[PDB]
Amino acid sequence: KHTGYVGLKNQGATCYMNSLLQTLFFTNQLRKAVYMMPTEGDDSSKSVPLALQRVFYELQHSDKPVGTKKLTKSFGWETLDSFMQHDVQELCRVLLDNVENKMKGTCVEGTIPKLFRGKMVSYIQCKEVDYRSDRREDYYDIQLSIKGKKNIFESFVDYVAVEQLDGDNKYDAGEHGLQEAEKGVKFLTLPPVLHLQLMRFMYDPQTDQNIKINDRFEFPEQLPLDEFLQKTDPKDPANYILHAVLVHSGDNHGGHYVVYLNPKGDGKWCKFDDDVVSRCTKEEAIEHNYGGHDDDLSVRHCTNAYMLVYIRESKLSEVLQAVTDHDIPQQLVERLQEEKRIEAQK
Ligand SMILES: CCc1c(-c2ccc(C(=O)NC)nc2)cnc(N)c1-c1ccc(O)cc1
Numbered sequence: 001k002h003t004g005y006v007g008l009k010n011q012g013a014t015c016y017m018n019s020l021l022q023t024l025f026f027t028n029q030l031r032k033a034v035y036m037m038p039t040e041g042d043d044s045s046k047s048v049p050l051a052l053q054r055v056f057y058e059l060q061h062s063d064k065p066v067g068t069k070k071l072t073k074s075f076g077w078e079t080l081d082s083f084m085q086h087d088v089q090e091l092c093r094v095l096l097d098n099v100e101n102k103m104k105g106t107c108v109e110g111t112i113p114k115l116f117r118g119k120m121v122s123y124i125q126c127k128e129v130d131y132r133s134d135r136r137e138d139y140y141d142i143q144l145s146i147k148g149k150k151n152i153f154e155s156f157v158d159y160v161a162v163e164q165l166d167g168d169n170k171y172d173a174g175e176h177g178l179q180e181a182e183k184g185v186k187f188l189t190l191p192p193v194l195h196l197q198l199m200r201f202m203y204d205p206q207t208d209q210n211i212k213i214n215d216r217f218e219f220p221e222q223l224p225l226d227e228f229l230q231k232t233d234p235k236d237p238a239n240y241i242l243h244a245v246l247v248h249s250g251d252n253h254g255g256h257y258v259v260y261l262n263p264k265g266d267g268k269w270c271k272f273d274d275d276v277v278s279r280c281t282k283e284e285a286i287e288h289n290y291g292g293h294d295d296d297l298s299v300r301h302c303t304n305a306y307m308l309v310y311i312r313e314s315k316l317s318e319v320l321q322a323v324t325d326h327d328i329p330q331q332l333v334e335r336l337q338e339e340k341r342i343e344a345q346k
Contacts, residue, residue: 001063005263007275008055009065013081014072016088016307019246019259021068022272023309024095025059026244026263027193028320033111035328037102040335048074049102052095057328057336065275088246088307089141089197115319116140116195119188121230124171126179136188141195147202151218155198156228160185186230190238192315196308201252210252214300216291219245221267221282223310240310241265247289249303258303260285265316 008018025031035057039050051071058066072078075094077086100112120137144155163183165171171181196219204211225238232238243265249256260280262269269285271278291304311319 001277003270003277003279005270005272005277006059006062007065007272007277008059009067010274011068011072013084014068015083015255016246016248016257017068017072017083017091018274019257019272019307020088020092020095021055021071022059022259022261023244023246024092025056026261026320027115027309028323029318030111030115030193031056031060032321032323032327033103033108034099035323035332036106036108037099038106039102040331044339045070046074048095048098050074052099053332054336054339057332060323060328061325087201089143092195093140113138113140115193116191118191118194120185121188122183122185124165124181124183126171126173126176126181129173129176129179131173131176131179137185140191141197143197143199146198146200146217147213147215149217152196152220152223155217156225160187160228187225187228188230190225190229190240190312192312192319194240194310194312196310198306198308200248200304200306212248212250212252212255214251214291214298214302214304216293217304218290219286219305219308221286222313236314239313241313241316242286242308243311244307244309245285245289245305246307246309247303248306251300251302260289263320265311265320 008021034053037049037053039047039053042050044050048071051074055066055068055071075098077083096112096116103109103111118139120139122135122137124133126132142159144152145158146155149155149158165181165183170178173179173181198217200213202211202213203209219242221242223240223242225240226232229238243261245260247258247260249258259272260269261272262285267282269280269282271280271284289303289305292301293299294301
């Protein structure tokens with residue numbers, strides 16, 4: 001072990017799960033809050049919050065690959081294809097909704113929206129009459145379209161592009177009944193931790209329906225997003241630093257899953273491939289995951305990003321604050337050592 005980090009066992013077709021688990025483990029401000037969940041009275045076999053605490057504790061302390069069977073048992077994804085029937089966004093939503101729920105009424109309540117919540121304005125503007133509706137919309141990740149988009153800038157541009165409402169899809173303007181309108185979204189705020197879902201898996205019907213888009217899609221190490229804000233802050237530009245690149249090798253149906261991280265936000269990347277963690281180049285983490293072409297029409301080649309984590313540069317120091325063995329409550333420590341004391345009588 002030259003990296004100082006430990007891997008996660010392969011225990012079935014859990015797909016994106018181990019990549020997610022590493023990505024959240026290294027969201028240090030999240031990890032510390034997770035350690036603070038009051039799990040002492042939890043049922044050791046039904047608690048997703050406890051199982052997540054246990055995986056984090058072992059990731060932080062173990063020298064051997066960390067198992068997850070208690071985790072998959074706790075949120076009930078235990079059949080042969082349970083993870084194949086979902087995606088990384090539903091897993092993460094479920095996990096983090098579970099931990100935030102366990103945080104209610106505690107000092108660490110509101111951690112999840114603090115780290116992940118951003119605000120948009122969704123607006124509908126009538127063309128031939130004077131009505132505009134402006135509403136705030138909260139989001140916790142961003143799904144970016146990648147088909148026909150060459151880079152992340154083009155994806156964000158498409159995301160805030162104006163949609164027309166006319167003909168068979170006209171707008172209910174109430175008192176001025178049906179009106180031709182323009183529908184759009186602008187960003188008000190962007191969160192400290194920015195999860196970008198790259199929409200390579202696109203459910204193309206009807207009705208086969210499984211597909212995966214392997215086209216080239218570039219993303220940068222430094223992502224400036226000020227130009228997509230309704231209003232910019234001179235003291236806090238929306239500059240984001242790439243933290244994690246979650247990678248899939250293959251096409252639809254079958255594939256291999258890896259995550260690249262620079263856990264400290266310092267540009268020193270590692271590759272996390274289940275139980276194997278090793279240092280890699282910045283080029284392996286970034287440019288080599290853009291996807292590409294070798295043969296004609298397709299090959300494919302075939303190892304590209306489907307999710308990215310960026311951290312706001314001004315928030316990097318806080319999100320990635322150090323975690324020590326002293327940040328783990330003794331109640332949790334003793335419970336896990338007792339568990340490891342029950343598992344070692346085999
Ligand atoms: C923060 C998780 C989340 C929530 C969400 C928001 C709030 C709460 C909550 O406060 N629950 C009590 N739970 C889940 C809602 N939609 C989402 N797409 C996500 C999400 C975020 C990052 C990802 O990579 C994938 C999914």
